[PDB]
Design a protein around this ligand. Sequence first.
Ligand code: J20
Ligand code: MG
Ligand code: ZN
Length: 334
Amino acid sequence: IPRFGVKTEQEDVLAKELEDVNKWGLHVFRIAELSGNRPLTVIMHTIFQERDLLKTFKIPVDTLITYLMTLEDHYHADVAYHNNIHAADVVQSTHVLLSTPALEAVFTDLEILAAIFASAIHDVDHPGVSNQFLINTNSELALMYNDSSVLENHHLAVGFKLLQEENCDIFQNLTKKQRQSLRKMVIDIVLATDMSKHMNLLADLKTMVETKKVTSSGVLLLDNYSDRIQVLQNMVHCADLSNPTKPLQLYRQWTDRIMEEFFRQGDRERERGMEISPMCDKHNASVEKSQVGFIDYIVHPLWETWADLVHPDAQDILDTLEDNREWYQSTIPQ
Ligand SMILES: COc1ccc(C2(c3ccc(OC)cc3)c3cc(O)ccc3-c3ccc(C=O)c(C#Cc4ccc(O)cc4)c32)cc1
Ligand SMILES: [Mg+2]
Ligand SMILES: [Zn+2]
C-alpha cells in the first residue's frame, strides 16, 4: 500500500479510524472497507503495537502480518455473520474489556496475549451453520469431533495449524513453558465460546461475583489458574455476545447479518426435509421479538453479571444494551 513513505488518501482515513481502537463502538465496518476487507489484520496489528506485544514477545512484524493475513483468509468471505469482521470485532472488544480499571495489572502479558489470540481465532473457518446442524446432517466435522463442541474444536485446530505455515509462527521466540501455557489457555478460552456452555459459565461467574475479592485499590484479586481462566473465558464470551451493547447502528447491521446466515441455514434445512431450527425460518420470523428475547434471557443476564464483577467500569456498556432493548421492544409490530 505505501508510496514513498507518505500516506494515501484511504490509508490516512484508515489510520484515523484506528485511533479509536481503545473505544467501544469502533466503526468496525468502516475499517473493513477502508482496509480492503482486512479488518482482522489491521486491528490485530494495531492492538499488538498499542500493547507493545511485538517487543515483549520478540514477534517479527513480517511474521505477524503473514500469519494474520493467512488466518483472515480462512474466515469465509461468503458467510454473513461468522466472518473476519466478526473476529476483528471480538478481538477489539476483548481488547477494551482487558483495559477495564477493575483488572489493571491483574493479567500477565502472556494471559493478555492468549485472550487476544483466542479472540482472533475463535470462529475461524466457520461454515455458516450451527453445531446442531452439523450434528443432524452427519457432517465430517461432527464425525471428527464426536458431536462435542464441534465448531469450537475446529476453530482451535485451524488456528494453531496455520502457525506452522511459512513464516507464520508468531510465537517462535516464546520459551517452551510459555508456549505450553499459552496453548492451554487459548484452548480453555475458545472451548468456552460454545453456546451450549453459556448457562454453566454464567452460573460460575455469578458465584465468583457473590464471593468477589478485591485488593487495596479496588482491583480484582485472582489467586489461581481456575479463577484467572474463568474470567478470561467469560470476558471473551462477553465480547462474542457484545453486539447488543454497541451503538444501535452497529447493532442493527450485526442483526441484519446474523438473520441472513440463520435464514440461509433454514433454507438448506428445508431442502433436505428437516425441521427448521429456531431463528432459521424466514417465513415464520419475528426479528424484533427475538432480539428482545435474546437480550432478556441471555445477553443482559451475562453483561449484568460482568458489570457486577467490574462495577462500575461497565455501566455505559450496560446502559446502551438496556437502551437498545427498549428500542427493539418499541418496534415490535402490532
Ligand atoms: C442456527 O443456530 C442457532 C440460532 C439461534 C440460536 C439461539 C440461541 C439461544 C441461546 C443461546 O445461548 C446463550 C445461544 C443461541 C436460540 C435458540 C433457541 O432455542 C431459541 C432462540 C434462539 C435465539 C434467538 C436469538 C439469537 C440471536 O439474536 C440466538 C442466537 C445466537 C447465536 C448463535 C451463535 C453465535 O455465534 C452467536 C449468536 C438464538 C442458537 C443457535
Ligand atoms: Mg463460535
Ligand atoms: Zn463468535
